[PDB]
Design a protein around this motif. Structure first.
Motif, mmCIF file in Angstrom:
data_model
loop_
_atom_site.group_PDB
_atom_site.id
_atom_site.type_symbol
_atom_site.label_atom_id
_atom_site.label_comp_id
_atom_site.label_asym_id
_atom_site.label_seq_id
_atom_site.Cartn_x
_atom_site.Cartn_y
_atom_site.Cartn_z
ATOM 1 N N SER B 1 0.761 -1.134 0.103
ATOM 2 C CA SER B 1 0.067 -0.095 0.043
ATOM 3 C C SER B 1 0.818 1.174 -0.085
ATOM 4 O O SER B 1 1.854 1.248 0.571
ATOM 5 N N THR B 2 0.482 2.331 -0.719
ATOM 6 C CA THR B 2 1.235 3.349 -1.131
ATOM 7 C C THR B 2 0.519 4.628 -0.620
ATOM 8 O O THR B 2 -0.753 4.640 -0.871
ATOM 9 N N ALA B 3 1.032 5.332 0.232
ATOM 10 C CA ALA B 3 0.395 6.420 0.780
ATOM 11 C C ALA B 3 1.085 7.741 0.234
ATOM 12 O O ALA B 3 2.385 7.646 -0.212
ATOM 13 N N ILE B 4 0.153 8.764 0.088
ATOM 14 C CA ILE B 4 0.771 10.152 -0.379
ATOM 15 C C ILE B 4 0.837 10.953 0.841
ATOM 16 O O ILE B 4 -0.408 11.062 1.466
ATOM 17 N N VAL B 5 1.760 11.727 1.384
ATOM 18 C CA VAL B 5 1.551 12.651 2.316
ATOM 19 C C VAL B 5 2.129 14.008 1.758
ATOM 20 O O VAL B 5 3.381 14.089 1.329
ATOM 21 N N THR B 6 1.464 15.039 1.825
ATOM 22 C CA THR B 6 1.787 16.369 1.243
ATOM 23 C C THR B 6 2.284 17.333 2.312
ATOM 24 O O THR B 6 2.205 16.985 3.714
ATOM 25 N N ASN B 7 3.004 18.367 1.855
ATOM 26 C CA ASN B 7 3.685 19.380 2.683
ATOM 27 C C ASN B 7 4.224 18.782 3.904
ATOM 28 O O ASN B 7 3.996 18.953 5.158
ATOM 29 N N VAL B 8 4.931 17.739 3.709
ATOM 30 C CA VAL B 8 5.421 16.798 4.596
ATOM 31 C C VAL B 8 6.197 17.205 5.837
ATOM 32 O O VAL B 8 6.177 16.983 6.874
ATOM 33 N N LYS B 9 6.784 18.344 5.507
ATOM 34 C CA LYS B 9 7.918 19.217 6.373
ATOM 35 C C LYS B 9 7.077 19.839 7.351
ATOM 36 O O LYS B 9 7.481 20.613 8.219
ATOM 37 N N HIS B 10 5.679 20.057 7.288
ATOM 38 C CA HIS B 10 4.986 20.971 8.125
ATOM 39 C C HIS B 10 3.490 20.426 8.682
ATOM 40 O O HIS B 10 3.373 19.326 8.116
ATOM 41 N N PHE B 11 3.035 21.150 9.670
ATOM 42 C CA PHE B 11 1.567 20.866 10.144
ATOM 43 C C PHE B 11 1.785 19.392 10.480
ATOM 44 O O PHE B 11 2.334 18.897 11.358
ATOM 45 N N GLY B 12 0.682 18.511 9.752
ATOM 46 C CA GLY B 12 0.658 17.064 10.210
ATOM 47 C C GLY B 12 1.511 16.368 9.528
ATOM 48 O O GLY B 12 1.307 15.073 9.543
ATOM 49 N N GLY B 13 2.288 16.766 8.736
ATOM 50 C CA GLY B 13 3.162 15.927 7.750
ATOM 51 C C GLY B 13 3.884 14.918 8.217
ATOM 52 O O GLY B 13 3.873 13.849 7.798
ATOM 53 N N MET B 14 4.768 15.148 8.998
ATOM 54 C CA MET B 14 5.697 14.195 9.785
ATOM 55 C C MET B 14 5.033 13.227 10.574
ATOM 56 O O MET B 14 5.594 12.257 10.647
ATOM 57 N N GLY B 15 4.157 13.749 11.546
ATOM 58 C CA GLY B 15 3.485 12.591 12.184
ATOM 59 C C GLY B 15 2.673 11.510 11.325
ATOM 60 O O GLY B 15 3.057 10.408 11.552
ATOM 61 N N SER B 16 2.086 11.847 10.075
ATOM 62 C CA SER B 16 1.327 11.064 9.236
ATOM 63 C C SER B 16 2.275 10.229 8.628
ATOM 64 O O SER B 16 2.175 8.992 8.720
ATOM 65 N N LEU B 18 5.307 9.448 9.072
ATOM 66 C CA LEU B 18 6.373 8.483 9.962
ATOM 67 C C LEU B 18 5.386 7.530 10.494
ATOM 68 O O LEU B 18 5.967 6.284 10.537
ATOM 69 N N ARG B 19 4.310 7.562 10.892
ATOM 70 C CA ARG B 19 3.349 6.760 11.467
ATOM 71 C C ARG B 19 2.902 5.667 10.383
ATOM 72 O O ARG B 19 2.769 4.472 10.486
ATOM 73 N N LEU B 20 2.470 6.133 9.170
ATOM 74 C CA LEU B 20 2.162 5.398 8.164
ATOM 75 C C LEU B 20 3.191 4.641 7.749
ATOM 76 O O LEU B 20 3.157 3.423 7.377
ATOM 77 N N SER B 21 4.232 5.023 7.616
ATOM 78 C CA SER B 21 5.619 4.375 7.264
ATOM 79 C C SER B 21 5.851 3.217 8.367
ATOM 80 O O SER B 21 5.812 2.169 8.097
ATOM 81 N N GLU B 22 5.476 3.452 9.501
ATOM 82 C CA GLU B 22 5.715 2.361 10.742
ATOM 83 C C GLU B 22 4.644 1.336 10.477
ATOM 84 O O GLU B 22 4.883 0.152 11.022
ATOM 85 N N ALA B 23 3.295 1.610 10.165
ATOM 86 C CA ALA B 23 2.284 0.924 9.889
ATOM 87 C C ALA B 23 2.564 -0.241 8.643
ATOM 88 O O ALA B 23 1.891 -1.076 8.319
ATOM 89 N N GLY B 24 3.829 -0.024 7.861
ATOM 90 C CA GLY B 24 3.943 -0.604 6.659
ATOM 91 C C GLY B 24 3.734 -0.146 5.297
ATOM 92 O O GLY B 24 4.167 -0.616 4.409
ATOM 93 N N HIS B 25 3.160 0.963 5.529
ATOM 94 C CA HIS B 25 3.006 1.811 4.232
ATOM 95 C C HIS B 25 4.327 2.078 3.259
ATOM 96 O O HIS B 25 5.312 2.682 3.992
ATOM 97 N N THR B 26 4.395 2.135 2.142
ATOM 98 C CA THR B 26 5.272 2.973 1.264
ATOM 99 C C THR B 26 4.781 4.243 1.369
ATOM 100 O O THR B 26 3.760 4.538 1.086
ATOM 101 N N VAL B 27 5.732 5.354 1.703
ATOM 102 C CA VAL B 27 5.210 6.603 1.853
ATOM 103 C C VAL B 27 5.854 7.759 0.970
ATOM 104 O O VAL B 27 6.821 8.213 1.288
ATOM 105 N N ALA B 28 5.081 8.152 0.012
ATOM 106 C CA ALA B 28 5.691 8.953 -1.106
ATOM 107 C C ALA B 28 5.288 10.548 -0.170
ATOM 108 O O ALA B 28 4.273 10.706 0.268
ATOM 109 N N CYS B 29 6.262 11.234 -0.152
ATOM 110 C CA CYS B 29 5.977 12.608 0.568
ATOM 111 C C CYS B 29 6.160 13.649 -0.629
ATOM 112 O O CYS B 29 7.249 14.086 -1.500
ATOM 113 N N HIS B 30 5.268 14.788 -0.344
ATOM 114 C CA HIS B 30 5.430 15.947 -1.223
ATOM 115 C C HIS B 30 5.810 17.172 -0.210
ATOM 116 O O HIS B 30 5.591 17.147 1.060
#
Ligand code: K
Ligand code: K
Ligand code: NA
Ligand code: NA
Ligand code: NA
Ligand code: NA
Ligand code: NA
Ligand code: NA
Lengths: 252, 253, 253, 252
Positions: B1-16, B18-30
């Protein structure tokens, strides 16, 4: 006093405008058809107690009305945009920019233009006609629905800053409001003529009918009267008890 | 499963992310900064578990993640805008346009580019990170408050059409969310360090603390997990019980 | 047209009754104190336009007003309870029972006795005066806050069944409503006279004043008039833009 | 940790209880059938990871659980009452007192009993299972609906005082939640078996299905975990996008 009612020929325009005149107000009316002269003049003729204006942009219209009638005491932002149902992927992004410009940017722009004088007089009322659609959304109308919600929330957020200056701000969210000859949004045909459509309204509203222009106007005038300023920030669901939720099989 | 997280350096970016990653997703970051190769490569070094992309535009991003990592299963539209407080008369109308573009059009545009792929498989999860501002507004933030309501309503609206295709749609509306080194919207400085700020937060939230990036990330992952799809359409107020409202003269703070 | 206004000496009683009277209704009035003839007759003397009844119980009252003045067209359930602030563990469960009985059961019971007559004619108007507390709760008023939500939801719920019979049902939820000589809930003393109280009200409401009995009465009359039946089911927050929420350190009050 | 789940055999009971045990919690279960011994014992047999209790009144049960397992860390108030549809005039007033006792007084009483220890430890979570019915009310259910709303608001109002003591308070409002063998409120028959009923659920929910016990339990455990305490005061509409509002004639 002096009121402005936009897009007077559609949606909540005629109810609000004509009820306001009955309250003794001078009522300047905006509309798109008034960029022409035949149209403004015919309307001014048909309605002597109403003052149509050719002004089309927001801040223009506010200045005009202020020059002609001294000031703007009441603003009724009667905003409209044609609802297009589309699954989300089938819209263009300009379609949502469309909705937002017409249903959030416009009311914002108006209030941006008129607030200063209201705040200096420490008197004024502001009414947005929005929609009850966010309260009970149909599928496939995400542009229209969400933009309406933004408008309603604008009204409520303004109520917080403008209370200090004695200025109420309201949103009226209709649904199923009879708009007579206006296609925005519930014209007589089909909405009163066709049994299909009458049966639907009957099913989905608790009062089992369309709202009337007269009811909308009564609210608008009661609010702009200064009678119940303490309701400031209210969003009003002028929807007749919509939605009526389908009950379990077997029950009427 | 591939997630996308936007504006990853700000607001809820990093928590999302990092935790999606820990859950096992591949996390593409914008992120805005990733249009520069230096930034992009710095980030990938610090976070080998995350996959920074350089694509800035919606259709362009979705496309790139799809080519790279097969498909997009989870979209986290972590939308940001610098809020500016003004009385309404002191804003430009352009200040509202700006806010709507960043806070409404952008999530719209991401969903508009991604939904068809999700609808064919009949799977996917969409999460908007919006704000709790509409729930307890401050005076003189009319633009940001209204635009955020608009994006929250959009998630709810979309949930009604996407349900048919087993795609839940959610909005998470934070407030007082610790943002660490990002200025959007509650950095360590001053929000954990300045005494006036610590005292403010203590008074106005019921938990008397800022929310954590970890709390936000757990929610994002929980919602994207498939564990509770039947919440679809929910706007979540992630605000620690804000607002606390001042009680009568005489009663304790 | 015959209205009934309850607990007329308190909360929204006097504004409702006086303004309904001015609109032309015959206004039958209930109050605890009217079970004593002295009280009843005092009130009728001061207000010849109003019709005080001595009946205390719901079925008993509705019946009496119907015999006396033909029928009941408008019910204003002006419900009251002395709120007491406690942490939840410091309440008795009986304190919750008490609050529900006064704030939910009572309006239920009045509607339950009156609705059949209204439903036969297919006309009538029902208004609950509840509270805005659920919309901005204070800590340590759990009983009163929840019970008021319950009565507001009851009005909304009832609107769905009564619509069929052209009977609108509304809830008006005040806050900071000037109550004059009634202690329910914002008397002249201290709320207009004590400097701490005047300052509190100024800060926490957007209009920076108490709401007036006159404003409440105009709304009650407007809603009972037939001018805007299509609002049926509405909960109205008559609270002057409360709550105002404390903004960040540094920004003006 | 130690949790309590009321009315464990119905509504949101089995999902919550059994998911909590999987999270490693000791889970004391209340139910009405446990005033008897055959019942408690059979249940304790069938579920070794669950601890049924015979206690029936609120404060009794809290003390018991605290004696047996040291303390109460999590309270899941799974409240139930049989919905009777009745036009308002046809109810007795005791019918509304019924609803209120079962759906507001009970959860209140429980929290009144357990708060002190949570506040002293400055740790605990409280979950009310209420209903999404106030969010989309059917006609003729005014008792049930309004009492549920009171419960949900209780949860939110408690969140305000108990945040100071690090204690989250949540309400979960379901609708269309499959309750398997429980008549409260969506048993397998008819709600999965009969086409009438399947077609209805399909029409009125966006996800076009009943909610699962597993989804409810997942939420309950995620919340009671201490993972997302900042959602305190949330009311959760666990309703699958219900209601789906009937659209205009002609459109699917
Ligand atoms: K307008
Ligand atoms: K319980
Ligand atoms: Na509409
Ligand atoms: Na201001
Ligand atoms: Na924010
Ligand atoms: Na109150
Ligand atoms: Na239910
Ligand atoms: Na407390």
């Amino acid at each position: 006093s002096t009121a402005i009612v936009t897009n007077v020929k559609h949606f909540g325009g005629m109810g609000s405008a004509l009820r306001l005149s009955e309250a003794g107000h001078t009522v300047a009316c905006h509309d798109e058809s008034f960029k022409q002269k035949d149209e403004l003049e015919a309307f001014a003729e048909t309605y002597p107690q109403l003052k149509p204006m050719s002004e089309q942009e927001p801040a223009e219209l506010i200045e005009a009305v202020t020059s002609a009638y001294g000031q703007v005491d009441v603003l009724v932002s009667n905003d409209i945009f044609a609802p297009e149902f589309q699954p989300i992927d089938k819209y263009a992004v300009e379609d949502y920019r469309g909705a937002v410009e017409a249903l959030q940017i416009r009311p914002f722009a108006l209030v941006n233009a008129v607030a200063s004088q209201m705040k200096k007089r420490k008197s004024g009322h502001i009414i947005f006609i929005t929609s009850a659609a966010p309260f009970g959304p149909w599928k496939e109308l995400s542009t229209y629905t969400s933009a309406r919600a933004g408008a309603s929330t604008l009204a409520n957020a303004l109520s917080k800053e403008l209370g200090e200056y004695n200025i109420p701000v309201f949103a009226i969210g209709p649904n199923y409001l009879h708009s007579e000859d206006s296609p925005y949004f519930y014209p007589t045909e089909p909405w009163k003529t066709n049994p299909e459509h009458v049966a639907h309204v009957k099913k989905v509203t608790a009062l089992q009918r369309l709202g009337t222009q007269k009811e909308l106007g009564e609210l608008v005038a009661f609010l702009a009267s200064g009678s119940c300023d303490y309701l400031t920030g209210q969003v009003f669901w002028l929807a007749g008890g919509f939605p009526m939720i389908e009950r379990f099989p077997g029950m009427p």
